Amino acid sequence: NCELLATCSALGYLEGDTYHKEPDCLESVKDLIRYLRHEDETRDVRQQLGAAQILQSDLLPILTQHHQDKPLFDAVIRLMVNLTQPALLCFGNLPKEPSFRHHFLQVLTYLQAYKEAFASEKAFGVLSETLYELLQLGRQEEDNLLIERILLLVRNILHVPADLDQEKKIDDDASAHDQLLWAIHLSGLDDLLLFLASSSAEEQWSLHVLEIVSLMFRDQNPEQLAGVGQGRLAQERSADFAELEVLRQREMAEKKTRALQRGNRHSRFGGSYIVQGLKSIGERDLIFHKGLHNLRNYSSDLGKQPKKVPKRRQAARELSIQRRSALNVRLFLRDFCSEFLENCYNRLMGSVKDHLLREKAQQHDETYYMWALAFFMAFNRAASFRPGLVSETLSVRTFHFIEQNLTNYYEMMLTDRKEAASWARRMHLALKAYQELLATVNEMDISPDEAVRESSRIIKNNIFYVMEYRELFLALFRKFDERCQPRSFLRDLVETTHLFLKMLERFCRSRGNLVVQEKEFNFLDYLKRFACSTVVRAYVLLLRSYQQNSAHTNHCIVKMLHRLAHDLKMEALLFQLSVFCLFNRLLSDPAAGAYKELVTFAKYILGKFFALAAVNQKAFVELLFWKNTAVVREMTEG
């Protein structure tokens, strides 16, 4: 430790607010590079430099005050570009070994400190001025390299994640990412991103600008971002008072129910009762030791602890939570997003698609391209501008491209067991983008223009005639798994299914019959494929969280369930004890008034069950087990 801490001091010293470099500072930073060139795989030199806080202590003063020496400026920039490179790229993965895990965490800690240190607007200002000078040349390879490393420096600074677990800030407060983003605006560096994105000859930089822009907007979804306006202050104030009111009210109500359930006399007042005629697990009647009031809602299991699960038996879970940034940041982001869509989207997408098609040996990350089209199409649609603003993406090639990518991800998720989690994440991203394409063609039907309506019919015609889009949903439902994907994937999949069936039904109405890739089609025959009992199990799992599901989610799932049960007459497939337990809890909750469709559907299907049970007593056995299609149909025959 002491060796580096002693030698690194050579760069200079600070006098009040004036920084004085040493006369061999350049040779000194060259020695720091020589240290890094012979660093250990644990990244020990980087941890030592971080402990010595060289970047915060000397490099920021050198860049702010001594940048007139362009060779020294170049040396400092490249040094900190190597130092700031994200930990996942340095180690190659999050390490399995505890020693390397500790080193990774420590390196990432120093990177977090560097990100906080970089928040000074003066650095971005100098960087933007330098970059503004470089682009005026219409240059040497070293000039291009300086542009490259400037872009990569801000990329690396943005890339290292914020520790929301450390910050624990309330909504509308600024995180480290938020403050740094605001500093980008305050420096004017954003204007250069829009120049680079809009200028045609800068296509080589546009691929980097895509990563920069997509890194900035991560915390804000485009729909709520499009929602913002100057009156939001009073809106949030009044709404928060209302939210606090209902929260307090709910706790009061629940308390009183518990208070009435408990007896009034103290916990040692005693007593004992025999439930005459109710036999035990043993040969004789049950003896009950608890208070008299408890028998009003008795179930024998109330005394039991839950079953202890094995470690490897646990399902997947979310590592993320919804947020909103400070109103200043929200307004700035909305302006930037509007200006990017206005000036840059189609040109940048054409450039990025060109690079992804041409430059396959370079292994560029396609997920950013899909993220950007998924984000900006949603923003454009939320603002309901003319479809011309997103013209480039409105073509069949996008559907085929994302289908082959999504099916590749699906096949890899199945085959490449060692990376199935990441393949599932990639597949989920692709599904999200595809849902936006469907929403876009649906929206232009309700436009006033016949030309775009005809274009919509052309796209939808190809999508429904070809096999892949109508087969894909069944392929995903067939291989959904609790370890493989969290429930968010299932929500997206079933909602996309409802939208696909809606547009399919509307398209089938155009002619006496639809012919498809070759066979005469039948909508009811296609829906019969979803009568697989595994699909119903997934639907029931999604239904357990109906109070936490969105209103749109609940509408979509209940609509599809009623259609499948009623019109296909497959009703007996829903006669299940797990479902009946959920129905019992549903009808017991006093909040049932909010869920009229669900309770009426539940009472309807239970009516069918009790009507059958009155005739046939075997239903009480069938209720324990899942049905094959033949059994579902045979139960009505008896």
């Binding site: 518990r258 408990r262 103290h266 916990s267 040692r268 007042f269 005693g270 608890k290 602890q305 839950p306 202890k308 699960v309 470690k311 646990q314």
Partner: protein
């Protein structure tokens, strides 16, 4: 009644929270036993659930000590005693020295041989679980107005004092005037002295007037007296913490204080 404890809080519903992931759960409790969770159901990590004392739900209890009354004793014996527990509403309704009738449930409990060991003694201790206990206007204004408007009311009110004393009318008038007093710098209240032989009815007269006024007090100048004229500091027989004992003169502020063998 002999003695009354300080108020005791008592658990009703324990509140458990996970250290790892802040998930919470509530446990209704069973004749003094708490069913502590072994594992957090949300995050599947054992021995991670903690009892939060001030978030739990509590009740009030008090311990009262009572003695048989002197009338119903066998001759020459010392008296017996029992312990009573009173909950919620009844928890502060009696004070030492007074007398009551009580209805309750006669309970019996085992006791442990030492605080560490789990063995119990073969002879049980019993107590009473209390359920109920009993202790053993314009019309008036108009009557007072008419009576005050009657002649010789001063003589009549004086005559009403101490009917056992047949002739000392002007002394009764002086005592009546002391009870009425002046009104509010200068001392507005009145002080009176009675002198003469011992065995005369003056002590009976003090005890009579003492019983007529709400803020009254009575004691003797002798060192054998029940409460002193002087304030002092002593250790509480229960907690052995200090308590400030003010004297009869302080307690009788805005009241009458009768002193004997002055």
């Amino acid at each position: 009644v002999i003695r009354t404890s300080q108020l005791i809080p008592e658990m009703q519903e324990a509140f458990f929270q996970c250290q790892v992931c802040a998930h919470t759960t509530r446990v209704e409790m069973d004749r003094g036993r708490i069913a502590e969770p072994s594992v957090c159901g949300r995050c599947h990590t054992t021995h991670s659930m903690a009892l939060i004392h001030n978030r739990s739900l509590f009740s009030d209890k008090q311990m009262i000590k009572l003695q048989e009354s002197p009338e119903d004793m066998p001759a020459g014996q010392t008296p017996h005693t029992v312990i009573l527990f009173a909950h919620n509403d009844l928890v502060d309704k009696v004070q030492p020295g007074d007398r009551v009738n009580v209805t309750g449930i006669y309970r019996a409990v085992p006791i442990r041989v030492n605080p560490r060991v789990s063995n119990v003694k073969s002879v049980y201790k019993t107590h009473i679980d209390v359920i109920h206990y009993r202790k053993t206007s314009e019309k008036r204004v108009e009557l007072l107005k008419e009576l005050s408007r009657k002649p010789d009311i001063y003589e009549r009110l004086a005559s009403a004092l101490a009917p056992s004393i047949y002739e000392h009318e002007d002394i009764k008038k002086g005592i009546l005037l002391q009870l009425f007093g002046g009104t509010r710098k200068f001392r507005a209240e009145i002080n009176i002295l009675l002198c003469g032989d011992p065995g005369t009815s003056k002590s009976q007269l003090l005890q009579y007037v003492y019983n007529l006024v709400p803020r009254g007090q009575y004691t003797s100048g002798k060192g054998s007296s029940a409460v002193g004229l002087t304030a002092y500091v002593m250790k509480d027989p229960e907690t052995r913490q200090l308590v400030l004992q003010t004297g009869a003169l302080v307690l009788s502020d805005n009241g009458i204080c009768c002193i004997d063998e002055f």
